[PDB]
Amino acid sequence: TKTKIMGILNVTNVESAVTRVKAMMDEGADIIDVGGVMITVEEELNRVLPVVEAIVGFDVKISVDTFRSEVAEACLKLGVDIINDQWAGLYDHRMFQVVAKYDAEIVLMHNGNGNRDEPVVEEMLTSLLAQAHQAKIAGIPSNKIWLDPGIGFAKTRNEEAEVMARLDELVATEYPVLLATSRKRFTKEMMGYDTTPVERDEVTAATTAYGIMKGVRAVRVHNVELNAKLAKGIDFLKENENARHNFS
Amino acid sequence: TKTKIMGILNVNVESAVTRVKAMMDEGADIIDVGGVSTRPGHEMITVEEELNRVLPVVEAIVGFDVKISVDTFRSEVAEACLKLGVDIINDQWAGLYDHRMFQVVAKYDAEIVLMHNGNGNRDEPVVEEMLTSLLAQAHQAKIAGIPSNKIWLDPGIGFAKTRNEEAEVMARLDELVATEYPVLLATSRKRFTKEMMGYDTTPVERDEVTAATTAYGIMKGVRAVRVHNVELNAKLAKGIDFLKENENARH
Ligand SMILES: Nc1nc2ncc(COP(=O)(O)OP(=O)(O)O)nc2c(=O)[nH]1
Ligand SMILES: [K+]
Ligand SMILES: [K+]
Ligand SMILES: [Mn+2]
Ligand SMILES: [Mn+2]
Numbered sequence: 315t316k317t318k319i320m321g322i323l324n325v326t327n328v329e330s331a332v333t334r335v336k337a338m339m340d341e342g343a344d345i346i347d348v349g350g351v352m353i354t355v356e357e358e359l360n361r362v363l364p365v366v367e368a369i370v371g372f373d374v375k376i377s378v379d380t381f382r383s384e385v386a387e388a389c390l391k392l393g394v395d396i397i398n399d400q401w402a403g404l405y406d407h408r409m410f411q412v413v414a415k416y417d418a419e420i421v422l423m424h425n426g427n428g429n430r431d432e433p434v435v436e437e438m439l440t441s442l443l444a445q446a447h448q449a450k451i452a453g454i455p456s457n458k459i460w461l462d463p464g465i466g467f468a469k470t471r472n473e474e475a476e477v478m479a480r481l482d483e484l485v486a487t488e489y490p491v492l493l494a495t496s497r498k499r500f501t502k503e504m505m506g507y508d509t510t511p512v513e514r515d516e517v518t519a520a521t522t523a524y525g526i527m528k529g530v531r532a533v534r535v536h537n538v539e540l541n542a543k544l545a546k547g548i549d550f551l552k553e554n555e556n557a558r559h560n561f562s
Numbered sequence: 563t564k565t566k567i568m569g570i571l572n573v574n575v576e577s578a579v580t581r582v583k584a585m586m587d588e589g590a591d592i593i594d595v596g597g598v599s600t601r602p603g604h605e606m607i608t609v610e611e612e613l614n615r616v617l618p619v620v621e622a623i624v625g626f627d628v629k630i631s632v633d634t635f636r637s638e639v640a641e642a643c644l645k646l647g648v649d650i651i652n653d654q655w656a657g658l659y660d661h662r663m664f665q666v667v668a669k670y671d672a673e674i675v676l677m678h679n680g681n682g683n684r685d686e687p688v689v690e691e692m693l694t695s696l697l698a699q700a701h702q703a704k705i706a707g708i709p710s711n712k713i714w715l716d717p718g719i720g721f722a723k724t725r726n727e728e729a730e731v732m733a734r735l736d737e738l739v740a741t742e743y744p745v746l747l748a749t750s751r752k753r754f755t756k757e758m759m760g761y762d763t764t765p766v767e768r769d770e771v772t773a774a775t776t777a778y779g780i781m782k783g784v785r786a787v788r789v790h791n792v793e794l795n796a797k798l799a800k801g802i803d804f805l806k807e808n809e810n811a812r813h
């Protein structure tokens with residue numbers, strides 16, 4: 315019933331990572347998204363693995379931002395819960411098998427096809443739904459697949475503005491939607507100037523509120539506390555609204 | 563047009579000017595100055611004490627490039643302020659405390675915020691009682707000479723209402739917005755935001771849930787928000803206005 319808060323942990327110390335994870339859990343993170351990725355599968359594993367081994371025992375879900383089944387599989391043997399795939403299984407078809415094999419969840423982020431024929435929304439829907447079908451025919455449950463519009467990838471300024479004005483249509487596919495705009499160019503431009511990254515937390519929080527109201531079920535963010543608490547408030551307001559209107 | 567940010571200035575004079583400057587920098591469109599409260603159980607003061615507290619501050623900030631609103635329910639304090647060039651009179655009694663208010667406000671061509679207050683022992687639903695009351699007062703503000711597009715309605719979250727009644731109102735902000743008078747939401751760090759937190763915090767820690775009420779309220783159509791943390795809310799309001807314009811522009 316509650317909006318999930320996926321915290322961002324970029325791994326580009328294991329000790330500092332661990333301390334940061336507890337700090338994030340503390341600020342309200344439901345999922346800790348670890349990511350460290352052109353480098354070698356081996357190099358990617360050299361950065362991501364030591365962290366995953368240290369934090370996977372904690373009482374929080376661990377997502378791993380990777381697009382290669384080899385990185386996803388070593389992580390899943392350690393007990394990881396989600397594979398946040400920026401390519402939506404396009405980069406390595408074997409991602410679907412690795413995930414099915416460990417009864418995990420997977421995020422399918424819209425990416426590629428930058429010079430698309432069709433308008434961005436029809437294309438994103440077509441591609442993402444096509445990837446969802448592949449996930450399932452691999453044996454991954456329907457309810458373990460998330461869709462991500464992929465703000466910041468293979469889309470022009472105009473295309474993303476279109477995508478952000480029609481989030482309801484992605485939500486309408488009934489798959490749980492993860493919004494991930496945090497501190498991106500799109501948020502930089504909401505501010506209207508060349509802001510530094512951190513300066514983008516408040517507009518990012520705006521996307522969270524707006525997205526939750528459009529039906530997004532999770533938000534991927536750098537500033538956990540701000541979004542965790544802004545989301546709590548918005549969730550509260552919608553529920554209160556349903557209650558007082560006897561809407562369900 | 564954007565959502566206006568009315569910063570709260572609770573009332574020495576230099577200390578106040580400092581805080582007004584900062585609020586302007588954080589994005590404040592209006593600075594709302596008050597020295598009184600209409601909460602039963604709170605200190606009551608004289609018109610004269612309100613003046614000593616309020617007038618020297620208004621005098622020193624009315625020149626700035628920001629609108630000034632004065633939170634008062636007595637027209638003598640109002641006029642004293644309108645004579646210094648103040649732009650808005652924020653009335654916790656919607657002109658029911660002092661019946662000369664609308665005439666004073668319209669005399670200096672100002673704006674007025676009519677806040678829902680009183681009759682906490684009503685037996686009809688809060689919402690229809692508030693609408694009936696606020697619209698009757700508004701109708702009276704126009705008779706006196708205040709144009710409709712300068713009469714604001716405020717649901718008075720935190721005044722003469724039960725937790726049950728505040729939740730009723732927050733779930734139906736659009737009905738107030740539907741009246742077509744510009745709407746000001748003022749929930750900052752109040753008890754309602756404390757329920758949202760679901761626990762006890764110092765006032766400052768209620769800022770994020772206050773900001774959620776801002777995002778939500780803008781979605782519902784309110785035109786301004788009265789807040790303590792101007793920056794968090796000004797920056798948030800800005801993102802929401804953009805998301806909303808973008809969505810309307812694209813449809
Ligand atoms: N128009 C309007 N004016 C108001 N003035 C004072 C308070 C609450 O007063 P207090 O409890 O003293 O706190 P603060 O002055 O910080 O808001 N609330 C409103 C309000 O909801 N709407
Ligand atoms: K875990
Ligand atoms: K001024
Ligand atoms: Mn639409
Ligand atoms: Mn006050």
Ligand SMILES: [Mn+2]
Nearest residue numbers: 559733734736
């Ligand atoms: Mn309704």
